[PDB]
Design a protein around this ligand. Sequence first.
Ligand SMILES: Cc1cc2nc3c(=O)[nH]c(=O)nc-3n(C[C@H](O)[C@H](O)[C@H](O)COP(=O)(O)O)c2cc1C
Ligand SMILES: COc1cccc(-c2ccc(NC(=O)c3ccsc3C(=O)O)c(F)c2)c1
Ligand SMILES: O=C(O)c1cc(=O)[nH]c(=O)[nH]1
Length: 364
Amino acid sequence: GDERFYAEHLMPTLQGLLDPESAHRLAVRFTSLGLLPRARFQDSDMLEVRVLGHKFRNPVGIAAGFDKHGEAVDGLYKMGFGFVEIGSVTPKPQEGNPRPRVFRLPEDQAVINRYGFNSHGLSVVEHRLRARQQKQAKLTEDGLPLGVNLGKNKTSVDAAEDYAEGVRVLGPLADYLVVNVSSPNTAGLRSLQGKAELRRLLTKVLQERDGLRRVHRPAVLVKIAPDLTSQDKEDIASVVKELGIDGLIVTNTTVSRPAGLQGALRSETGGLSGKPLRDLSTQTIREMYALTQGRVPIIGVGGVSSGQDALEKIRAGASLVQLYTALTFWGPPVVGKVKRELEALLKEQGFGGVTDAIGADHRR
Ligand SMILES: Cc1cc2nc3c(=O)[nH]c(=O)nc-3n(C[C@H](O)[C@H](O)[C@H](O)COP(=O)(O)O)c2cc1C
Ligand SMILES: COc1cccc(-c2ccc(NC(=O)c3ccsc3C(=O)O)c(F)c2)c1
Ligand SMILES: O=C(O)c1cc(=O)[nH]c(=O)[nH]1
């Protein structure tokens, strides 16, 4: 493939022929089949990162949402991602919201989605991952970890138990689990970010995680929204420290609509991703890093489309970064682009490697 070809011809043509959701489905299909452009870039030692009890070949991963049901994990590693996160997965299967539920904002290099946790359910995903469990074991040992993002059912009467079930069912198959309490498309989900409820919720999740056999015991991270108040962030940092949460994913999509959006569909209900979210996410990473005294690993997500975007989040405190929306606009070549640009910037700024740059802004 070619970065310019995909950005100017292939992707534009695809988006002109298929609606957003159909384009996504096709994307998952092609990826699962390995129909991807040549992954030129060769990961250098400079990009290697050790965190969350694992080695990561490179710090660029695919964010949750692209492979909700764990159907294209291997194809995603082939695309060049240093780690893959599937999900969110709900206990029981559910359809999500009616279509259309995803919209492109071309003029803003953004997307708005309100899928509503469409999920094949824990059982289906469980067997899908078991079919390649040993293959993943080798991938992980080779520096390509797998993360599993857990969600809750729309009609659930016990949010905590939904997450507990996810820990028990998919925890044994993941390197890290994500307690996603930041989806803007699930009524009352974000309220789980409150201190009182959060502590109770995470205490239960951690107990279930600790109850798994050693080799099947994943790290547990909490994914937060970019729309939290200063009080919310202080509370989350406090609870994370109190319970020993392994890490944070910052951030999910935003329900805010920054001044300046041009897309005709800017007022659609849902979470906004892409460039308009980038700096709000970076600043959230910066604050959480400071609140946790840089002792809690952070996976930075939100508007990453270049090496500069990645490095800004790393310097702000992220040990790893993820992207999704950039892929929807530029295609597979964007992964290699980000890694190549990141490597060059690290050298240009005097960093021996990614590890040396983590939280660098806080030390100046
Ligand atoms: C279409 C779509 C679906 C998503 N689904 C999920 C999900 O199921 N779980 C989750 O934790 N985040 C989900 N996200 C959020 C992304 O993981 C990420 O936090 C956010 O989009 C910011 O990254 P980006 O600007 O690179 O897309 C989704 C995002 C998009 C655009
Ligand atoms: C042969 O070339 C390839 C190979 C492998 C994957 C893709 C591809 C195609 C479309 C999307 N796009 C989305 O998956 C998407 C998600 C939510 S919206 C939206 C979109 O197009 O607007 C992609 F990420 C990757 C193209
Ligand atoms: O499934 C969705 O609608 C969804 C979940 C989530 O966590 N984030 C997002 O942007 N959409």
